[PDB]
Amino acid sequence: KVSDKRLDVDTSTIEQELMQNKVDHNEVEEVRQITDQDLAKIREVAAREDLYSLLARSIAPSIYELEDVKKGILLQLFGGTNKTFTKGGRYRGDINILLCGDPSTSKSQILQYVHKITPRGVYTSGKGSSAVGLTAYITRDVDTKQLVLESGALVLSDGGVCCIDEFDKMSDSTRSVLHEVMEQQTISIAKAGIITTLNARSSILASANPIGSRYNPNLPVTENIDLPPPLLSRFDLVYLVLDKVDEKNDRELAKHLTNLYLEDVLPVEFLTMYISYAKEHIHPIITEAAKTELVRAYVGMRKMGDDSRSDEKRITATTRQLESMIRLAEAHAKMKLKNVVELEDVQEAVRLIRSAIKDYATDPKTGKIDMNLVQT
Amino acid sequence: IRLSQALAKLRLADMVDIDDVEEALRLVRVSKESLYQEPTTKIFTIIKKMLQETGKNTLSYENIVKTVRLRGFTMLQLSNCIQEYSYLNVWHLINEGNTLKFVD
Numbered sequence: 195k196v197s198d199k200r201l202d203v204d205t206s207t208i209e210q211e212l213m214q215n216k217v218d219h220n221e222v223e224e225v226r227q228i229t230d231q232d233l234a235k236i237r238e239v240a241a242r243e244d245l246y247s248l249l250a251r252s253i254a255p256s257i258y259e260l261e262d263v264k265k266g267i268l269l270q271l272f273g274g275t276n277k278t279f280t281k282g283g284r285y286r287g288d289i290n291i292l293l294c295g296d297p298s299t300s301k302s303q304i305l306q307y308v309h310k311i312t313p314r315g316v317y318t319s320g321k322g323s324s325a326v327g328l329t330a331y332i333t334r335d336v337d338t339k340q341l342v343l344e345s346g347a348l349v350l351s352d353g354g355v356c357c358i359d360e361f362d363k364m365s366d367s368t369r370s371v372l373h374e375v376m377e378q379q380t381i382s383i384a385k386a387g388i389i390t391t392l393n394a395r396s397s398i399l400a401s402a403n404p405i406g407s408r409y410n411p412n413l414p415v416t417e418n419i420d421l422p423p424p425l426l427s428r429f430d431l432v433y434l435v436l437d438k439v440d441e442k443n444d445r446e447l448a449k450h451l452t453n454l455y456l457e458d459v460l461p462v463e464f465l466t467m468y469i470s471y472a473k474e475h476i477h478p479i480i481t482e483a484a485k486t487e488l489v490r491a492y493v494g495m496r497k498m499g500d501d502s503r504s505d506e507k508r509i510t511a512t513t514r515q516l517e518s519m520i521r522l523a524e525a526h527a528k529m530k531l532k533n534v535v536e537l538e539d540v541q542e543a544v545r546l547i548r549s550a551i552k553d554y555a556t557d558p559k560t561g562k563i564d565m566n567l568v569q570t
Numbered sequence: 571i572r573l574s575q576a577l578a579k580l581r582l583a584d585m586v587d588i589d590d591v592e593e594a595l596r597l598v599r600v601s602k603e604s605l606y607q608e609p610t611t612k613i614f615t616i617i618k619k620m621l622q623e624t625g626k627n628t629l630s631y632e633n634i635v636k637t638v639r640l641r642g643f644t645m646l647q648l649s650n651c652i653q654e655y656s657y658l659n660v661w662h663l664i665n666e667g668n669t670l671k672f673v674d
Contacts (some may be wrong), residue, residue, distance in 0.1 A: 371646075410666075411666060412665060412666070412668050451571075452571075455571065565666070
């Protein structure tokens with residue numbers, strides 16, 4: 195139940211299976227062994243000055259793309275801190291990302307690469323899924339000829355990543371089931387034979403196609419994506435991938451691609467090992483200096499566009515954005531092996547949230563993007 | 571790249587050549603040549619008529635297309651006109667094809 199090239203399962207979800215294995219004396223090993231030379235290497239690299247760039251660079255070493263896009267995948271892999279209350283009530287740290295933008299980009303490869311690095315996952319198309327196919331169903335076993343219950347797409351993705359491609363092409367009936375999985379990370383089934391609540395602790399990675407040929411900078415974002423504006427606010431990060439014609443970016447991309455048809459970064463093994471180590475041992479906790487900045491940032495974000503709320507030009511800010519900042523600060527702290535979330539983490543989180551939506555080039559009155567200011 | 575690779579495989583070679591890339595470029599260019607199979611001044615006079623009867627230097631491109639179509643023309647004709655007098659430095663098309671601006 196291990197592989198060098200894939201990540202280790204989340205121990206936060208299998209606590210009692212570990213206890214049962216010891217009571218049953220089965221030596222099936224779930225997590226991998228770490229020698230001390232390799233653990234010394236871990237801190238030797240974790241001390242490096244350019245850790246953040248190096249990690250972002252080694253995520254997908256064959257996708258010439260902005261490092262902001264890759265950093266979101268890197269922080270999605272680490273995940274937020276899972277918190278358990280002793281009076282019932284669970285808070286989880288799963289990150290949800292949307293990749294909107296023109297076609298003819300490398301969004302598709304990101305989803306495939308993330309499918310193949312995460313231990314548990316399922317790949318779904320837009321107009322190829324049903325509610326029954328995502329939740330559960332009853333089937334006839336050709337061996338015993340009786341009726342048994344079988345798991346669905348989202349329940350099989352418990353403690354992993356689920357990749358939904360062409361999210362905008364999906365029916366309102368099928369989009370209905372995702373609300374509960376994005377709110378409470380559960381599913382409630384009341385069908386003939388089963389009345390129970392299931393655990394779906396999964397990360398959502400979705401890509402959407404813009405209306406018409408290309409993204410139109412002259413229109414607002416709410417008019418370019420066929421998705422209700424209220425649904426757009428449930429995602430932690432929204433990535434606008436825009437295409438601009440610029441001669442030195444094109445030159446670099448062409449050389450990059452042609453170099454692959456001939457005959458520093460961290461190899462796959464070391465990357466996965468580092469991520470598993472961090473996800474396994476350390477646990478970050480927030481401080482007051484971070485709380486001040488979090489509250490200030492949320493108030494500042496809400497105060498913006500207070501007048502531009504009746505008209506759906508920009509995406510209105512809600513409490514889920516506050517929770518997104520919390521989650522991203524905790525993930526950035528987990529990277530670099532700290533147990534303390536300082537002010538740098540919150541500043542980086544807010545920087546990333548604004549940079550994803552391209553808020554450094556948007557006119558807050560009309561909702562339009564100046565492409566002369568969108569630099570590669 | 572794929573087309574050049576296909577042509578190389580047809581010669582039974584190991585290296586890819588430049589005459590192979592030229593053949594792929596000629597195919598990609600030839601694919602769309604029926605659209606250019608057949609006015610500049612007459613469309614120019616019409617556009618300058620509707621700039622007057624307005625006042626400013628900006629002019630919506632969607633209205634230009636609609637008005638020119640009702641007169642009776644082809645969309646190739648309009649494209650040839652915009653580019654030609656864009657090189658004579660009379661106007662430029664800005665905002666990704668949304669507005670037309672006359673330089674002074």
